[PDB]
Structures are given as C-alpha cells and as structure tokens.
Design a protein around this ligand. Structure first.
Ligand SMILES: O=C(O)[C@@H](c1ccccc1)S(=O)(=O)O
Length: 106
C-alpha cells in the first residue's frame, strides 16, 4: 500500500511540492512522492538540493510503473515496488541531485 507510506503525498501539484521543499530547514535530499501532473499511471519524486550557486532548490523526477510490474526513474534501474525504489535511492545518488534523506515536513 503506497497510499499508506508517509512519504507519499498523493495528489499535490508541482508548485505545492516546491512550497513544501523550499523551507530553509530542509537539508539536501529532503523528499516526497506525489502523483505526476500530466502522465497517467506515473508518479513524481520531488527532492530538495542546496549549493552555493543556486542555494536551496528543488528537482522533480518522473517515476514510471510498468503493467509488467516494474517501477523506475531510469529503465536501466528497476524495482519490484516503489518502497524498494525509495530505499535504493536513499543509499545511492546515481543521477539524482542528492540521495534521499528525510521525508518533507508538511
Ligand atoms: O508531469 C510530471 O510527472 C512532473 C514532471 C517531473 C519531471 C519533469 C517534468 C514533469 S510534474 O508533475 O512536476 O509536472
């Protein structure tokens, strides 16, 4: 049950995810998973980042889910569940702006 996950914010917009993530108290990797605004069957991983050039900022990554079962941001790296995907990216930055750290406070 992905709806049961505390990091799943459901039906919130890209702008709302940015409002939540752009809080100065959020360290790099603060994140949430929400519905994609324009891709049916897809989710979006929103993550906070911070650097001396941009300061506090937010990146969004589309998560695809196959009818064949797999979940992925890049098709070369798939998972059997969204929970497994989140756990993997909490340990590996790979192409993300930062590894996933803490769930975005509301
Ligand atoms: O449509 C989407 O899933 C989202 C998205 C994610 C990354 C890039 C473009 C669009 S959005 O919900 O932020 O627009």
């Amino acid at each position: 049950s992905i709806q049961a996950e505390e990091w799943y914010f459901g039906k919130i917009t890209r702008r709302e995810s940015e409002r939540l993530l752009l809080n100065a108290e959020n360290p790099r990797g603060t994140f949430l998973v929400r519905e994609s605004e324009t891709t049916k069957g897809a989710y979006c991983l929103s993550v906070s980042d911070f650097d001396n050039a941009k300061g506090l900022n937010v990146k969004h990554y589309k998560i695809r889910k196959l009818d064949s079962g797999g979940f992925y941001i890049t098709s070369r790296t798939q998972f059997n569940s969204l929970q497994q995907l989140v756990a993997y990216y909490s340990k590996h930055a790979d192409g993300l702006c930062h590894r996933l750290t803490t769930v975005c406070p509301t």
